[PDB]
């Protein structure tokens, strides 16, 4: 897998963000995660968390997996990095997302995220509290 450049256009919610990628606006859906919706318990806190992480980054990167790069809604499916730190992993590690939507051939970081979920859950964070 390889990191590629992108720039923030706007934070949307916990697990989607609008980025510029190869010079075109795209909504990205974070691979391998699922955040509570805004109206749900922790929904505002998961939006805040992603928004801060992407709005504060000096450098946003996009990393596609080995499988499909866009979902059925036209969202890009990637791992997103903010100053070298994976947003997908960080949400999970903070108990603001669950590992979810694990499809074969787009699952390179599954075990990494599962480990982070186990630590969040051990720490009773947020959705595990
Ligand atoms: C994360 C992800 C979601 N999706 C689709 C499946 C779900 O379909 P349905 O809309 O039919 O439920 C939806 C979940 O996204 P949200 O959690 O953003 O709603 O996005 C993929 O197809 N591939 C993926 O890797
Ligand atoms: Ca969601």
What is the C-alpha separation between 98 and 81, in angstroms, rounded? 18
What is the C-alpha separation between 124 and 129, in angstroms, rounded? 4
What is the C-alpha separation between 18 and 39, in angstroms, rounded? 21
> What's the domain count of the chain?
1
Residue 113 sits at φ, ψ, to 5 deg, of -70, -35
* Resolution given for this structure, in angstroms: 1.9
Contact criterion met (CB below 8 Å) for 92 and 86 = no
Residue 65 annotated as lining a ligand binding site: no
Query: What's the distance, Cα to Cα, between the start and end of the chain in Å?
Result: 34
| Domain CATH code at residue 87 | 2.40.50.90
Tally Cβ neighbours within 10 Å of residue 102.
13
Residues 6+ apart with CB under 8 A from 48: none
Ligand 1: residues with CB < 6 A are 29, 31, 34, 71-72, 77, 101, 103
Distance 7 CA to ligand 1 centre (A): 23
Is 112 in a helix, a strand, or coil? helix
What is the C-alpha separation between 41 and 103, in angstroms, rounded? 26
Ligand closest to the CA atom of residue 100: 1
Question: What's the gap between Cα 80 and its chain centre?
Answer: 6
Is 21 in a helix, a strand, or coil? strand
In terms of residue numbers, what domain contains 54? 1-129
Locate 94 and state its tokens: 């903070």
């Amino acid at each position: 897998l390889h990191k590629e450049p992108a720039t923030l256009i706007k934070a949307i919610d916990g697990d989607t963000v609008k980025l510029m990628y190869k010079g075109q606006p795209m909504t990205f859906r974070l691979l391998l995660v699922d955040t509570p919706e805004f109206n749900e318990k922790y929904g505002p806190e998961d939006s805040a968390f992603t928004k801060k992480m992407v709005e504060n980054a000096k450098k946003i990167e996009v990393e596609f997996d080995k499988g499909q790069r866009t979902d059925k809604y036209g969202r890009g499916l990637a791992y997103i990095y903010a100053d070298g730190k994976m947003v997908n992993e960080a949400l999970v590690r903070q108990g603001l997302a669950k590992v979810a939507y694990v499809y074969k051939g787009n699952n390179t970081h599954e075990q990494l995220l599962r480990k982070a979920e186990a630590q969040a859950k051990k720490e009773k964070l947020n959705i595990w509290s």
